[PDB]
Structures are given as C-alpha cells and as structure tokens.
C-alpha cells in the first residue's frame, strides 16, 4: 500500500491510497454520522463530532476504516507495518487510550485539523484491543492530513512517534525515519531534459524524456515505492480544479500500483492493487476504482444521513 | 510510447499501446472498410482486403493510423524512432513501395497473419513521402502481431530489418537489438518471495513483496520502459476471458505510463500518457482510456459497415 496527501492551493484536502493485497476484503464505503452511539473501549471516541466517510467494514456495530475523511477537511489512512508496529498491551490511566481498530475513527470523528490531532497525540496510547478474533490483530501505521500538511503516526516497541511528513507520502515498513533518510540516496533524480553531456570526448544526448530520472526504482518493494511515490508526488504540478485533482490521485497511485504476476507474497500469491481510494474535502466525496474496473466511482457525503443515528453502509454510487 | 502483444491461448489477439506525448493529437477511432477507394502513392495499397479499426487521424481522405487491427486478427502500432529511422527518399522501381504514413494501413489492410506480412516485407521499401505539409515527417518503427507472435520492423540507414519480438513489447530508441541485449542486464529480477537470506552472519528477510524485483528501473527513459514492460508483461498470468484480458492491457501499460511532472522534453513540457488503446480480435473491438478519464471506452467494428465505401470517424461509443 502507498498513500499520498496534497492540496489545491485553495484550502482543499486530497488524501488517497492504494490497497495492495492478495485478495479483497469486502470493503464498502461507510458513513459514520454525528448521531451514532459510539462503542469506544476506553472512551477515546465518546461521540461523533465530525461526520466521517471512507472505505472499510462494519463489525460489532463499529466502523473499521481502512482510510477516511471527515466533514471538517481532515483525513487518515492506515497501512500495514508488521515487524515494526507494536501497540501497548493495556490502557494507561490518564492517557487518551485508543484501540488500534478505532484509530482512524478517532482521528476523523474528533478533530478538524492536523494541529488539533497532533496536540491530542501528546497523550495518546494505542492499545492492542482487538475488535474480535475474526482477523489477525492489526499491525498498522497511519498517515494523517489536512489541506496544510501531513503527519505520520508509528507506535512501536518504544512508544509513540509522530513525524512531519514533508514528502506527503507513506508506504509500508521500515519506519518513517528510515525512508526519509533513504531519500538522500536519490539526489540526482530529476525530470529535467539535458541537451548535451560530454563524457571524455563522447557527445551524449538523451534518447528522449527521463534521462535524469535514472535511478528511481521500479520494483514493488516498500522502500522502492516510498522513493518512487515521493518523486512522482513531489513533481506533479499543482492543480486548481476538482477534476484535475481527482485525476492527479489516480495517476500518481497508478505509478506505484501492483499488477498481477510481478511480485509474490510468501504464500506464492501475487500482490495487486485491489482498490485505489481518494477523499476530497472540496466536494466531501469519496472516489475509488478497482483492479477489475478503472472507471472512477464516487459517493458524496451530502447524499447520506450524516446527521443520522446509524452507520450507513453505502450501496449506491455515482459515475459507473 | 510502449506497446505490447499477447493472446489468450485460444487464438485471440490483444495488441495495446500508450501514446505518450506533451500534447494531445486529436486522434479518433477510424474504421477503414473493405469498400474504401484507396489513395496509395505507389500502389502498395490498391484495395482494402481486410477491414481495419484503430486510433488515428484522417487527412486527404486517407486514414493515418497510430495503431490498428483488422478483421483477420493482425494488428500493428507505430512508435517514435527519430535518430534511427531513415526512410528511402524515392520509390524503387520493382519494389513494394510503401509510404511511411500508410505503413500500418498496408499491414492491416492487406494481410491476415504475421507469416504473410513477414513474407511480403522481403520486397518492401518504406518511402519518405509525406501525406501533406502539416506535420513534421514521421520517424517511426512498428510492432506487428497476431495471436501467434510479434515482429518489430525498423527501417534505418541499414535498410529494413525484421526482428523476432520474443518479449512481445516495444518502446522507442535505440534499435530493437540494443534493447534485446539489454535484457541480459536484469537476469536477477524475479517476482519470487525469498523466505530468508544469510549475508555473512546477518539473517535477512524481505520487508514484503518485490524484494527480488530490485533492479527493475522505474524511470521514463525508453530503455527503462522496455525493460520494465518486458518484465511485467512476461510475468502477467495468461487469462482466458475478454474482461480479464482487457484489464491485463490497461494494468500492464499503467506500469510504464507517464504522468504529469515526472519527465520533461526539450521544450520543458512534461510527457504524459495521453491515451491507452487496445485492439481485441476476439470481439473485433478497440478499447481505450485517456489521461483525463480512466474509464474504458470501446468501439465495436460490427457496429459500423465494415464493407462500406467511406472511412468512418467514430463519435458514438461505449
Ligand atoms: C497494503 C497494506 O498496507 C495492507 C493493509 C491492509 C491489509 C489493512 C489496512 C487496514 C486494515 C483493517 C483495519 C480495520 C480492522 C482492524 C482489525 O484489527 S483488530 O481490531 O486488531 O482485530 C483487523 C481487521 C481490519 C478490517 C483490518 C484488516 C487489515 C487492513 C485492511
Ligand atoms: C510516444 C511515441 O512514440 C510518439 C509517437 C507519435 C508522436 C506518432 C505515432 C504515430 C504518428 C502519426 C502517424 C500518422 C501520420 C504520419 C505523418 O507522416 S508524414 O506523412 O511523413 O507526414 C505525420 C503525422 C501522423 C499523424 C503521425 C504523427 C506522429 C504520431 C502520432
Ligand atoms: Cl521459491
Ligand atoms: Mg474488490
Ligand atoms: Mg521518446
Ligand atoms: Mg485526448
Ligand atoms: Mg485507384
Ligand atoms: Mg463481404
């Protein structure tokens, strides 16, 4: 999985991710309205302050989000981090104790900006408290973004780490500081076109575009996707329309997507981009496409009872 | 630009390509029917033996195809090759003199298999004879495919050469022999998952998938796209349904596509994948999407009069 955060220069947030896996999870768009009665193990989510829309599943009358955005312009995505993620084994008195499964719900239902959730994270403990035993307990890290900036949250054996994500991307393991340092191994990667190099007495001109992009890796490994996504995302020109910004998400994530046959997991099955999802605060809409159909589908929070009392598992969508 | 050829194991051909450029060409789906009166400068295309569908433009009531397939399951795509392409400046008496602009029309309108066009190519001179003065004269090479195999045609200062394209892909410069030899620089690239390496006394486990794909380049340079496409295309599992094979084309070509900002041309403008097109002989349908809209659209040849007398520039599509 790879996630990205960006804006349009006019205060609107776009946060998008690939869900890469060897099978699909049965996920749907889920709306969590402001009147929903929460089921928060340690009271971190006492009520829904901001309505939430995103992709996930419902278990135990609880929304389990893979990624989601709220009606105040804040969004979050959870990505796999096994080997590094290690949550607290118990809640701590006085802390804001957040069960891992509800961490995205906590971010999006409680806060309206990265400043606010960053301030709240000063007291957070993320607890290994599974929703139930139907899936292996999660081992995740998260990217959180608003129109201004992104942060990355990693909870490991030495506790909570919050990073300034100044490249606005996230992939999988290892930890964020490792990937950020690794960017320093690609300082000669550039989109620029050189007209002529002389090497010794050889006049060398490019075959075409991309001659100084050489070195950006094309493989599916997590550190490689981080570098490749950081390059493509940094260099994509800012856009001012909803349509060009939707197109930016899907093109950028297609550059780090996984297709059949190219990389196996230990099972021997091939990892593939099962869906690509985008939250837009400008239109309070969740957009997505899937491995089987690249056409973009969408769900607008304005079409659903976001002031209602029940989780809405959305069955109808626009533009396909 | 990158092109691919594959089949479904049941005799059906899929040939697809990205059109990468700094601007849109205004291309449309063009059907050339068997009753169309040709405008072939040296008589290479005297009549349309097989109806053709593909993406291109029409000038002087002549279909100028970027890529196309015919009603017998043969298809062809033209990709940029400047610096290397060098056509004949005049027609050669006694040869099959094919104007470069009509080369894809010649392949698709005259022949029913790669065997047939390969035999005909022994006689061919490709001539620099522009359609008109509007565009710079083309400098191209081509991939030609049927359900059995692909060949690459390059016409250079060494003349016409036909290559056995046993990796079923094509990109831009340099020549096909160069790229084919370059494949030998990526022999350790693999999709396999290794459980555990020991380096000296360090136990090394993958972070996740892709640990042995390291080395496959991710940049937009032509040789890099050739290697990356050759890897993805070689390892994509064969599929037996139309839906899965359509999906295979668009996913494979998204792996080598170009998006805004990542690689500039000399002008300083960014090269982008403007459209991705696929010809399917199973359904005699041309499928495509565009930079602005990833939804797949399609035109079926059967919805147009394949034995009519006029070029059809399609507007109504799925
Ligand atoms: C490519 C990747 O990074 C893969 C991530 C993918 C497998 C994850 C991302 C979000 C996860 C779900 C989050 C919500 C719940 C959490 C449950 O944990 S528990 O409470 O400890 O039991 C596990 C199930 C589920 C649905 C996660 C499943 C794995 C994810 C889809
Ligand atoms: C990424 C790439 O490889 C880009 C290739 C792109 C620029 C080419 C591919 C097909 C070309 C057109 C083919 C048909 C005609 C041929 C004319 O040649 S002429 O008769 O010598 O004048 C030039 C115009 C046109 C439409 C070509 C334009 C360039 C291409 C779209
Ligand atoms: Cl093995
Ligand atoms: Mg699915
Ligand atoms: Mg080129
Ligand atoms: Mg266009
Ligand atoms: Mg005549
Ligand atoms: Mg007939």
Residue numbers in the entry:
A (entry chain B): 2 to 321
B (entry chain A): 2 to 319
List passages from the publication reporting this PDB structure.
Bile salt hydrolases (BSHs) catalyze the amino acid deconjugation reactions required to liberate free bile acids for subsequent and successive modifications and metabolism. The BSHs belong to the N-terminal nucleophile hydrolase (Ntn-hydrolase) superfamily, which is characterized by an αββα core structure that is subject to autoactivation. Here, we identify and describe the BSH from a common member of the Plains bison microbiome, Arthrobacter citreus (BSHAc). Steady-state kinetic analyses demonstrated that BSHAc is a broad-spectrum hydrolase with a preference for glycine-conjugates and deoxycholic acid (DCA).
To better understand the interactions between BSHAc and AAA-10, we crystallized the enzyme after soaking it with the inhibitor for 18 h in 0.1 M MES, pH 6.0 at room temperature. X-ray diffraction data were collected that resulted in the refinement of 1.6 Å resolution model showing a covalent adduct. Structural characterization of BSHAc reacted with AAA-10 showed covalent modification of the N-terminal cysteine nucleophile, providing molecular details for an enzyme-stabilized product formed from this mechanism-based inhibitor’s α-fluoromethyl ketone warhead. The inhibitor was modeled at full occupancy with the BSH oxyanion hole accommodating the product’s ketone oxygen atom. C12 of the LCA-based AAA-10 was notably solvent-exposed and a series of polar and non-polar interactions appear to stabilize the inhibitor structure. Specifically, Trp22, Phe26, and the nearby Tyr136 shift to accommodate the inhibitor, enclosing it from solvent. Finally, two of the C3-sulfate oxygens interact with the backbone amides of Ile132 and Ser139, and a series of water molecules are also present in the inhibitor-occupied active site. The position of the atoms in the SB loop differs significantly between unbound and AAA-10 bound BSHAc models. While the apparent flexibility of this loop allows for the C3-SO4 group of AAA-10 to bind, there is clear displacement of residues that are likely to have roles in stabilizing a substrate. Accordingly, this SB loop of BSHAc may impede rather than accommodate inhibitor binding.
